[PDB]
Design a protein around this ligand. Structure first.
Ligand SMILES: COCc1cc2cc(c1)C(=O)N[C@H]([C@H](O)CNCc1cccc(C(C)C)c1)Cc1cccc(c1)OCCCCO2
Length: 377
């Protein structure tokens, strides 16, 4: 019954993928950002310059106030609100209705994005990082307890406006090619994984693999960029700089601020390297790798000038809170959040990136010794 859920995600590039949901009786329809990097379900519940619509608790006969406040600070933006429960459905999802925790957003700061077209956020991670604390049952936990939906979902994010699929309750084999490769969920809070090796154009970065996961590595559809710990980010940028030194870039381009542009159709893709992330596998001493094309980490953006050129922003940036495999990494791939088996699966997506001579890939097996040493403690 998964064909009903294919193509149920929309978005604008860099502004988040959202799914249509309804809350309340009678159903109020809202676009909800799909976020594997948090665990709170929350919706605009008051006017805002960037909201075309919002949740009106007064109009819902099934609303229940929880008489508790809540606030969530993300890396980017924050909101506070009022906790309640209400009936929730996903029109292009499974045919079910759950009573779910809902944070009604009454104030926010740099949270809603102008033109993103979504009015709320669906945190799909685990209770441990839910606010105000882990007793607030996240939406997907509610869905699995109250219905027969199996305890897994999958994300096919298609890149640069944008669309994709969230398969709730299973895997749709028509959305990927090749084999699924699985990496363990190291701990059920974020979707934490372990990166065991990093290569740029086939050259090992030759860092202690603890640096890749300092202090954690997560799969986060709510973040746009590949974000890397400071030491790793410097090694990678240095290597990406050297591979493309044929051309000149402002040094604020490497910080994500300034664009770079080229005459339409002349982007020198060949001079940017591929990046390979090796992930811990399912069996002893075994890993696999995912390979990222420059078309994934050079995100296309609107031409700031009066021209019609190809302009790009650098979508690898620095982190002080660990590695974040953002939407830009996920776009190459079909990603299975197999919560029931504590693992995350990767396959080449059917809507994969297209280079002339190079291809995004998920390949294994690889042998990697001492993988447990790559986790940070
Ligand atoms: C250099 O890039 C920075 C950056 C860019 C960015 C979003 C985030 C960060 C962002 O913070 N996104 C969070 C995710 O939940 C974050 N996940 C990890 C996390 C970090 C801190 C605290 C928590 C707890 C709440 C669990 C969780 C979700 C979010 C919040 C606000 C807007 C948004 C998406 O718009 C989606 C489009 C992408 C917008 O671009």
């Amino acid at each position: 019954s998964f064909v009903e859920m294919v193509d149920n995600l929309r978005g604008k590039s860099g502004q988040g993928y959202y799914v249509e949901m309804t809350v309340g009786s009678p159903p109020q329809t809202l676009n909800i950002l799909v976020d594997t990097g948090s665990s709170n379900f929350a919706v605009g519940a008051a006017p805002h310059p960037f909201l075309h619509r919002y949740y009106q608790r007064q109009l819902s006969s099934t609303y229940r106030d929880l008489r508790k406040g809540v606030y969530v600070p993300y890396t980017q933006g924050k909101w506070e609100g009022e906790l309640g429960t209400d009936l929730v459905s996903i029109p292009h999802g499974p045919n079910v209705t759950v009573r779910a925790n809902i944070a009604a957003i009454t104030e926010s700061d740099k949270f809603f994005i102008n033109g993103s077209n979504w009015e709320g956020i669906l945190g799909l991670a685990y209770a441990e990082i839910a606010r105000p604390d882990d007793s607030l049952e996240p939406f997907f936990d509610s869905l699995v307890k109250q219905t027969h939906v199996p305890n897994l979902f999958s994300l096919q994010l298609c890149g640069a406006s944008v669309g994709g699929s969230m398969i709730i309750g299973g895997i749709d084999h028509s959305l990927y090619t090749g084999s699924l490769w699985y990496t363990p969920i190291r701990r059920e809070w974020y979707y934490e994984v372990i990166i065991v090796r990093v290569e740029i154009n086939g050259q090992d970065l030759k860092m202690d693999c603890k640096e890749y996961n300092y202090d954690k590595s997560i799969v986060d559809s709510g973040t746009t960029n590949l974000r890397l710990p400071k030491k790793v980010f410097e090694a990678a940028v240095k290597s990406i700089k050297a591979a493309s030194s044929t051309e000149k870039f402002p040094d604020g381009f490497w910080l994500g601020e300034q664009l770079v542009c080229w005459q339409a159709g002349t982007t020198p893709w060949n001079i940017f390297p591929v990046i390979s992330l090796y992930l811990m596998g399912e069996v002893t001493n075994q890993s696999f790798r995912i390979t990222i094309l420059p078309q994934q980490y050079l995100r296309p953006v609107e031409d700031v000038a009066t021209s019609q050129d190809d302009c790009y922003k650098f979508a690898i940036s620095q982190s002080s809170t660990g590695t974040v495999m953002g939407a830009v990494i996920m776009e190459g791939f079909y990603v299975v959040f197999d919560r029931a088996r504590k693992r995350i699966g990767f396959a080449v997506s059917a809507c994969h990136v297209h280079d002339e001579f190079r291809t995004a890939a998920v390949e294994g097996p690889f042998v990697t010794l001492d993988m447990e040493d790559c986790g940070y403690n």
